[PDB]
Amino acid sequence: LHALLRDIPAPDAEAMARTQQHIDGLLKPPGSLGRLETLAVQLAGMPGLNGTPQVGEKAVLVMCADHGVWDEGVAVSPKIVTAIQAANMTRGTTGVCVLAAQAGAKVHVIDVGIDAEPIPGVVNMRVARGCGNIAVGPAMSRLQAEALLLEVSRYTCDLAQRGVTLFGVGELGMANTTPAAAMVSVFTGSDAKEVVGIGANLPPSRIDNKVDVVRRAIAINQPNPRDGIDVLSKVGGFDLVGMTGVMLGAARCGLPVLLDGFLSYSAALAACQIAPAVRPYLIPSHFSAEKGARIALAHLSMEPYLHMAMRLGEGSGAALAMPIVEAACAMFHNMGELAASNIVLP
Amino acid sequence: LHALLRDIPAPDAEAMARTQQHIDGLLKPPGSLGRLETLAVQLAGMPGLNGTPQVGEKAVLVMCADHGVWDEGVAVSPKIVTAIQAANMTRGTTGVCVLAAQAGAKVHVIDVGIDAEPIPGVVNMRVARGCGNIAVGPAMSRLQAEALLLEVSRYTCDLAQRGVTLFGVGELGMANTTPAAAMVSVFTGSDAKEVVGIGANLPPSRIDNKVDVVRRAIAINQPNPRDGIDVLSKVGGFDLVGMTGVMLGAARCGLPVLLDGFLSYSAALAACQIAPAVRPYLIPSHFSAEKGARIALAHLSMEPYLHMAMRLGEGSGAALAMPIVEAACAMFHNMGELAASNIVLP
Ligand SMILES: Cc1ccc2c(c1)ncn2[C@H]1O[C@H](COP(=O)(O)O)[C@@H](O)[C@H]1O
Ligand SMILES: Cc1ccc2c(c1)ncn2[C@H]1O[C@H](COP(=O)(O)O)[C@@H](O)[C@H]1O
Numbered sequence: 001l002h003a004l005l006r007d008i009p010a011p012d013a014e015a016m017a018r019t020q021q022h023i024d025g026l027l028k029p030p031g032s033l034g035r036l037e038t039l040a041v042q043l044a045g046m047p048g049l050n051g052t053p054q055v056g057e058k059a060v061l062v063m064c065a066d067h068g069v070w071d072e073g074v075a076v077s078p079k080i081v082t083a084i085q086a087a088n089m090t091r092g093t094t095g096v097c098v099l100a101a102q103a104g105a106k107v108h109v110i111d112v113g114i115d116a117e118p119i120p121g122v123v124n125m126r127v128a129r130g131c132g133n134i135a136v137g138p139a140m141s142r143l144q145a146e147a148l149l150l151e152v153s154r155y156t157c158d159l160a161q162r163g164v165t166l167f168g169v170g171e172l173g174m175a176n177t178t179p180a181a182a183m184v185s186v187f188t189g190s191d192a193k194e195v196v197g198i199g200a201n202l203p204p205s206r207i208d209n210k211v212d213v214v215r216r217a218i219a220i221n222q223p224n225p226r227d228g229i230d231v232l233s234k235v236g237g238f239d240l241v242g243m244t245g246v247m248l249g250a251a252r253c254g255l256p257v258l259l260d261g262f263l264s265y266s267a268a269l270a271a272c273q274i275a276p277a278v279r280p281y282l283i284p285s286h287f288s289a290e291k292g293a294r295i296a297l298a299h300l301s302m303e304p305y306l307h308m309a310m311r312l313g314e315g316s317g318a319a320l321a322m323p324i325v326e327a328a329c330a331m332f333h334n335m336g337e338l339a340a341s342n343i344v345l346p
Numbered sequence: 347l348h349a350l351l352r353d354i355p356a357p358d359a360e361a362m363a364r365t366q367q368h369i370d371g372l373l374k375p376p377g378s379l380g381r382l383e384t385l386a387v388q389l390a391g392m393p394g395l396n397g398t399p400q401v402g403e404k405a406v407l408v409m410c411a412d413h414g415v416w417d418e419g420v421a422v423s424p425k426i427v428t429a430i431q432a433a434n435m436t437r438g439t440t441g442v443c444v445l446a447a448q449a450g451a452k453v454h455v456i457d458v459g460i461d462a463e464p465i466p467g468v469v470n471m472r473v474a475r476g477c478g479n480i481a482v483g484p485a486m487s488r489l490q491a492e493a494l495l496l497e498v499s500r501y502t503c504d505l506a507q508r509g510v511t512l513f514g515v516g517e518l519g520m521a522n523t524t525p526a527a528a529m530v531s532v533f534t535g536s537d538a539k540e541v542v543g544i545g546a547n548l549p550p551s552r553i554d555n556k557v558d559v560v561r562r563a564i565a566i567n568q569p570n571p572r573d574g575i576d577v578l579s580k581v582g583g584f585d586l587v588g589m590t591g592v593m594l595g596a597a598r599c600g601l602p603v604l605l606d607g608f609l610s611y612s613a614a615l616a617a618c619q620i621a622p623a624v625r626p627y628l629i630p631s632h633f634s635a636e637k638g639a640r641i642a643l644a645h646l647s648m649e650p651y652l653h654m655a656m657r658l659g660e661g662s663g664a665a666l667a668m669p670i671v672e673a674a675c676a677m678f679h680n681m682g683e684l685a686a687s688n689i690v691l692p
């Protein structure tokens with residue numbers, strides 16, 4: 001793991017410079033394609049991309065797990081929904097599934113800790129049958145967190161070996177917006193009230209309770225904000241850890257990762273805390289409708305491309321943004337050049 | 347024309363109600379897909395869509411024309427660029443071309459008034475060799491504006507006959523951000539300084555001049571804000587008129603139109619002024635980096651989905667948003683249902 005972290009490559013400034021120059025020469029006023037140009041340059045700097053903005057195969061990794069904190073009354077979805085939805089993931093009837101197929105991405109469902117019998121067709125990496133209830137103690141042990149980071153990290157990079165060049169992250173886990181808010185609070189130093197949202201339709205009345213649980217989780221565990229692994233283990237969840245692991249793996253592999261929503265922002269904060277070298281590989285997708293979204297994004301210094309008021313999770317926003325990434329590549333490779341038309345601008 | 351306007355269909359509330367109910371029953375927390383759900387409902391209300399969110403063939407209509415106001419020093423691109431770029435449109439090397447191909451849309455290049463010899467391969471609807479210089483008089487005659495609206499309107503609806511279900515609008519015309527700012531100022535009652543931008547890289551120093559030209563155009567022509575046709579004819583351009591005409595045609599045809607950037611917002615304001623019934627058919631794409639974008643969008647009461655800091659025009663933003671529209675359809679038609687999984691939420 002320390003190895004893993006040590007070996008994350010820096011971005012290739014040389015490739016980026018060449019990309020910039022090429023973009024500037026395209027059939028358009030310079031800088032006119034805005035963020036699409038910036039994105040293209042970003043991709044070019046990623047070592048696993050072979051010095052150019054390109055997209056081969058696409059995959060969305062969905063990390064599923066249950067949380068003990070569900071017992072605190074923080075979620076209206078029945079616990080079993082995690083197991084059910086996970087199975088549905090295998091049938092392609094879920095939101096991410098439909099969106100991924102639309103983008104031509106393949107969905108990978110990974111069980112990192114669902115509290116139910118194993119689901120056939122789902123990749124098994126189960127840590128335990130749900131994590132500990134963060135309201136009264138830690139979600140898991142440091143060892144447990146580290147091992148999972150390791151395992152997921154490797155799975156991720158292994159996919160790269162098989163042609164995958166673009167990843168998307170997602171999750172599934174009733175009550176998961178609770179540990180997510182906890183992490184956000186800790187990493188950003190914001191008060192719980194500021195970052196706790198309605199998650200999956202939590203009734204406005206039930207909010208106060210959710211805010212109390214978060215505070216309690218923090219007070220009780222005393223997570224160290226300067227130690228991402230500490231935070232994940234104490235007030236996180238298996239799903240959140242899995243997401244952070246995809247991020248670490250893609251970065252080590254020198255490949256891009258599309259973030260999703262609120263849950264993903266949490267994981268991103270952790271990953272960047274653990275390894276700042278991870279940052280350059282991350283790509284925002286959409287602006288989650290979760291209350292704590294703005295605070296979380298500010299801390300990540302990210303401005304998502306999509307404003308859809310989405311709040312489903314599963315990696316749905318990530319799938320939705322994939323065509324944007326492909327568009328930046330298309331721009332890069334298929335547009336004509338000013339010079340060739342004898343067009344001269346100032 | 348009055349006929350045309352008279353016959354624009356109202357949206358089908360019945361279809362919309364059925365769509366809403368269907369969406370609510372999908373495998374997800376209700377309302378969780380946010381704007382994607384709203385979009386799907388919007389599409390269902392469009393009569394040419396056959397009571398369901400669906401996308402068949404896609405087309406982007408690009409209206410090209412030159413402007414006399416170019417002579418006022420408001421644009422850094424050489425005048426000939428319009429003619430050149432238009433030809434390039436026929437070769438698929440332009441920004442819209444590349445993006446449209448990515449979305450599987452076909453680009454239609456229409457010459458409504460380029461000041462050059464006719465370009466083979468380009469649809470000919472030329473009004474004149476460039477419009478009048480709005481700084482000293484009107485761009486064209488009312489008759490001229492009306493006829494063009496008519497002609498474009500018809501072309502648009504005719505495409506519908508051939509399978510097109512989704513349109514995108516775009517333009518090409520050096521100096522066009524000038525008449526656009528003029529229209530915006532007039533329709534919204536905002537001062538010129540507030541809505542005049544750098545267009546295609548106009549140097550910050552040269553701005554004042556551009557602001558003066560706009561004021562002059564207005565003072566001199568005295569366009570009537572309550573009369574969209576009056577405004578278009580006086581301080582608009584052939585390209586802007588063409589765009590408004592696509593909007594009127596698609597609406598009459600009961601089909602959706604994706605807006606583009608700043609130029610398109612101008613045209614949208616005019617169309618909505620001319621016929622409010624047009625509104626429900628319009629769909630924002632991206633948030634243009636042009637200074638007057640915010641004011642224009644507010645008046646249209648629209649919140650674009652994409653924040654890409656784009657400012658190229660040509661219908662590039664429109665092409666970029668097409669996959670979003672298709673995504674809403676996919677959601678609608680391919681997701682599974684809560685009931686079927688025995689999932690019960692509150
Ligand atoms: C039927 C259903 C319900 C929720 C779902 C879902 C499908 N897909 C994602 N989520 C989202 O809701 C949960 C987080 O919200 P809270 O913390 O309020 O539970 C996670 O499962 C998240 O993926
Ligand atoms: C090479 C080139 C230049 C401009 C272009 C373009 C390609 N494609 C679109 N535009 C954009 O720039 C023009 C409006 O900006 P202004 O009012 O400053 O001229 C229009 O042609 C608009 O389509």
Ligand SMILES: O=C(O)c1cccnc1
Pocket residue numbers: 177198199200260261262263264288289290310311312313314
């Ligand atoms: O932003 C998300 O991804 C999200 C928000 C609420 C509930 N589930 C997921």
Ligand SMILES: O=C(O)c1cccnc1
Pocket residue numbers: 523544545546606607608609610634635636656657658659660
């Ligand atoms: O927003 C646009 O479409 C735009 C802005 C500047 C120059 N051309 C087009």
